[PDB]
Write a protein that binds this DNA or RNA. Structure first.
Ligand code: NA
Ligand code: NA
Length: 324
DNA sequence: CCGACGCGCGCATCAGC
DNA sequence: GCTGATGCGCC
DNA sequence: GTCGG
């Protein structure tokens, strides 16, 4: 809570910019500000003190002065009591309702969850499933539930084909106390960049046979997005439903994907800006050499995560320590 | 001053032909 | 019927 | 909104 009142404000402003204003660069500007402020180790006492930080400019500085002198933000107080704006903001908390659907709904008088319940006919399939599990989807997932979840995912995936490789990435892979969802990266030997896609459906189908996956938000041939729920012990309170994603990557790109999706995020930007001060370009799929021109060669065979630690030649930095 | 800002990705849905 | 654009939720 | 060419 050193600067919590300031970051809460910047994050509040950010959400309104994303959801009501539909100004995504302001959203990220506000969130960037909140990030550098949350990590600044002093109780900020002035907008001017703040403006020294990268991502804090004049306007956010002035907003801090008003916050620090009066407790509040006039613009925020006003927006907060504003029925149209705050309804739009709120409906975006329904998964499948982004800022356009929420603008559309608040135009036609749908402002609340109940209003959606009375107009299910006007929600696509994703939105219905977001509305149904609205509460569950806002709970975090404790690491201990992630382990049981990961037990089921790996058990069943090896059950369909012992040659599948599955990895749970996300902050969970780095050891997090809790997770917001489960991101599962899938691969098979029979799936290369130069390849046949039957493999995702087989795994989704097995996880629905054991009633682990309960609903389907979107499915294709390389990405699945849906809902899962741990089995209850018959007598106990039933676990909340959880968001789950499963990505079928090719094998020659898999460990690039594992690294990318594991992260953490800013770990990778260091990992990448400081990747090419060495001569091997990196993204999410491949590591490719460059030349004095700057055009890429052809990517060299990463078949374990740690050949991105040979090609750029860092030592071992495991899931654990990739905080940045 | 004025554009960049994830030099972003898979899938579901809509606008349009 | 199709393509391309736009909406969406994410590491 | 903040940065930088
Ligand atoms: Na600054
Ligand atoms: Na939403």
């Amino acid at each position: 809570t050193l600067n919590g009142g300031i970051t809460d404000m910047l994050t509040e402003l950010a959400n309104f910019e994303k959801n009501v204003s539909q100004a995504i660069h302001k959203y990220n500007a506000y969130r960037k500000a909140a990030s550098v402020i949350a990590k600044y180790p002093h109780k900020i006492k002035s907008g001017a003190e703040a403006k020294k930080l990268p991502g804090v400019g004049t306007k956010i500085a002035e907003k801090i002065d008003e916050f620090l002198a009066t407790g509040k933000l006039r613009k925020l107080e006003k927006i907060r009591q504003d029925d149209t704006s705050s309804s739009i903001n709120f409906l975006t908390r329904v998964s499948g309702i982004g800022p356009s659907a929420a603008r559309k709904f608040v135009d036609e008088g749908i402002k609340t969850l109940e209003d959606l319940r009375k107009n299910e006919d006007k929600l696509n399939h994703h939105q219905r499933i977001g509305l149904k599990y609205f509460g569950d989807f806002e709970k975090r997932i404790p690491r201990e539930e992630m382990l049981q979840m990961q037990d089921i995912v790996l058990n069943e995936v090896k059950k369909v084909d012992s040659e599948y490789i599955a990895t749970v990435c996300g902050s969970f892979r780095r050891g997090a106390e809790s997770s917001g969802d489960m991101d599962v990266l899938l691969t098979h030997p029979s799936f290369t960049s130069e390849s046949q896609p039957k493999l995702l459906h087989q795994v989704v189908e097995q996880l629905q046979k054991v009633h682990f996956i309960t609903d389907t938000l979107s499915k294709g041939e390389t990405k699945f997005m849906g809902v899962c729920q741990l089995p209850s012990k018959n007598d106990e309170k039933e676990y909340p439903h959880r968001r789950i994603d499963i990505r079928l990557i090719p094998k020659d790109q898999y460990y690039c994907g594992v690294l990318y999706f594991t992260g953490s995020d800013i770990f990778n930007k260091n990992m990448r800006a400081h990747a090419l001060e060495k001569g091997f370009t990196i993204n999410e799929y491949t590591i490719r050499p460059l030349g004095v021109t700057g055009v890429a060669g052809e990517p060299l065979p990463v078949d374990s995560e740690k050949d991105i630690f040979d090609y750029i030649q860092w030592k071992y930095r495991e899931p654990k320590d990739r905080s940045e």
